[PDB]
């Protein structure tokens, strides 16, 4: 049964147990995202959907926090804007300056959400440099430039839940965590190309195009 | 110079008192001509008065001859196409008072076949502008000597 | 560069995002101004309390009381102070930066006395 | 722009003729020269464009070393 809640002063109603981001979408409130997709399971790893709830001290993830009756959400205030700026700072810490040579240029969520919800300039100038990651060969259809991976886990979730291809996974730990087949394997499925569309960055791209 | 210092300031904060003044001024105009002024709008030292085509000549006479509103120089006449509106063309007028050093805007509406009154009877400078509006948009100005 | 914008520590962009802090365009139809007239303003309220004032506003949001009715019903102290000035006079076309002219004559002028062009500071 | 921070006079004429317009334009020559002198003497230091890279292109040495700078370059130029 539907409940009632307030988002930026607007009262909206959705079923109980729903995620907050769904309420914000029904209310016409735009909330950033990299790891949330309407058709994939909820992961809360990008930390870009953060919003302020009166109940909670810290900012909570819209993608995962359940909707409750009488909750008041703000997606406007200084804590949220600072949070988005900080998260994009960390996201673009080790991201490669491949925008000219990247095929996602012009249709990149990272570009657009850096322009909208992030800083104008970076403060990363470390002499030791950025992280590097080697490119994987997962077949003749999906081209890999895995320095651009932001570790959203959309590809893995798709391949393991919607397609039934459990060969793709999350190997390693920490900053050296790498998405791919731990050994050279192909992404054998008749649905592999949707990985190209699900990746909000150009880590997985169309090879003939 | 070692370090250049430039403060962070909002450019709109410079306008606030003038904005209130324009609001009061527009309220006076609306209260003096409630038959004609549909609305007014105010943004950053720009006041727009919102009227109908029948109300062009009266309101312009007021804006030309009234002592507190001596807008004597025609600046521009333009049209804008909003094809989602039932009355697609919005005919815009821009006026200046060198007496009081102030600008005002007046907006009406039109269609491809419904005309607007010409203000050439008041501002001779409107001739060429109204002609251009016809040539570019098709707005017919009724009363114009040579359109 | 300049200091408060080049700083690397206490310089969040949202504190200097002036584009997204742009001023809205206020629009006033005749309904909204008779509300300011029949009722008051947030600076000079003349509205009842609770639900009474709420549906008093609602009577203006819909066509209950008209603008001419509100002008006729308006006191002297409303008009003379919220429509006209305190002295009863109409307000002039406002000027953002008033410029008071001065004429330069004689030796500091551009052309001598005979010529038909003058100098205004 | 900066005309409130520089001293110049305005020429105004009677009789509305072409001679008065000519004299006005020559006075405007001389006042423009005055303004150019003052600006060459009082040219400040700092940036020449807004320091918001969401409106203006960043410098090249940041576009070729900073990720945000390159993103903003890309978007502003596309």
């Amino acid at each position: 049964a539907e409940i009632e809640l307030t988002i930026d002063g607007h009262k909206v109603s959705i079923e109980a147990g729903s995620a907050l981001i769904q309420a914000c979408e029904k209310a016409g409130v735009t909330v950033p995202r990299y790891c949330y997709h309407d058709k994939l399971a909820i992961a809360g790893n990008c930390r870009m959907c953060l919003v302020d709830v009166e109940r909670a001290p810290k900012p909570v993830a819209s993608c995962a926090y359940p909707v409750a009756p009488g909750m008041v959400v703000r997606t406007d205030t200084e804590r949220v804007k600072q949070a988005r700026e900080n998260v994009m700072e960390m996201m673009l810490q080790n991201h490669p300056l491949d925008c000219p040579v990247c095929d996602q240029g012009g249709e990149c969520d990272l570009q657009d959400q850096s322009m909208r919800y992030g800083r104008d300039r970076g403060r990363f100038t470390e002499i030791t440099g950025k992280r590097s990651t080697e490119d994987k060969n997962i077949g003749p259809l999906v081209k890999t430039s895995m320095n651009r991976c932001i570790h959203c886990t959309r590809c893995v979730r798709f391949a393991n839940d919607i397609a039934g291809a459990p060969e793709l996974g999350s190997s390693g730990r920490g900053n050296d965590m790498q998405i791919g087949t731990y050994l050279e394997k192909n992404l054998n499925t008749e649905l592999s190309g949707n990985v190209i569309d699900l990746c909000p960055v150009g880590a997985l791209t169309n090879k003939p195009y | 110079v070692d370090e250049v210092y430039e403060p962070i300031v909002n450019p709109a904060d410079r306008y606030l008192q003038h904005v209130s003044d324009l609001h009061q001024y527009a309220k006076y105009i609306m209260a003096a001509l409630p038959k004609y002024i549909q609305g007014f709008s105010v943004w950053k030292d720009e006041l727009t008065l919102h009227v109908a085509p029948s109300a062009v000549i009266p309101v312009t006479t007021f804006l030309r001859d009234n002592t507190s509103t001596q807008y004597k120089s025609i600046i521009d006449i333009t049209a804008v196409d909003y094809p989602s509106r039932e009355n697609r063309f919005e005919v815009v007028y821009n006026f200046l008072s060198v007496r009081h050093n102030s600008r005002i805007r007046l907006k009406t509406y039109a269609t491809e076949v419904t005309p607007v009154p010409s203000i050439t009877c008041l501002y001779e400078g409107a001739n060429w502008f109204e002609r251009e509006a016809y040539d570019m948009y098709g707005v017919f100005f009724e009363g114009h000597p040579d359109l | 560069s300049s200091y408060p914008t080049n700083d690397i520590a206490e310089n969040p962009y949202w504190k200097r995002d002036h584009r997204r802090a742009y001023p809205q365009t206020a629009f006033f139809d005749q309904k909204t101004v008779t509300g300011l007239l029949e009722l008051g303003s947030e600076a000079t309220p003349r509205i009842a309390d609770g639900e009474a004032g709420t549906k008093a506003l609602a009577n203006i949001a819909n066509g209950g009381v008209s603008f001419t009715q509100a002008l006729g019903k308006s006191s002297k102290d409303v008009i003379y102070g919220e429509v006209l000035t305190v002295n009863g006079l109409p307000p002039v076309a406002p000027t953002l930066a008033p410029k008071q002219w001065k004429i330069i004559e004689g030796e500091a002028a551009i052309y001598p006395k005979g010529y038909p062009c003058r100098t205004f500071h | 722009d900066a005309y409130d921070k520089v001293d110049f006079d305005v020429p105004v004429g009677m009789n509305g003729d072409c001679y008065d317009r000519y004299l006005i334009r020559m006075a405007e020559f001389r006042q423009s020269l005055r303004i150019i002198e003052q600006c060459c003497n009082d040219m400040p230091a700092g940036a020449v464009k807004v320091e918001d890279f969401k409106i203006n292109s960043p410098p090249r040495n940041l576009m070729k070393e900073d990720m945000e700078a390159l993103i903003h370059h890309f978007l502003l130029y596309t």
Partner: peptide, 29 residues
């Protein structure tokens, strides 16, 4: 123009009406 931004570029602005021209909120009770 097909490369227009898919994300909303600039939010709502800033209310710069004076308090003399905002309608009065009635006192709660």
């Amino acid at each position: 123009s097909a490369g227009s931004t898919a994300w909303e570029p600039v939010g709502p602005g800033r209310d710069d009406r004076p308090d003399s021209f905002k309608l009065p909120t009635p006192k709660p009770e």
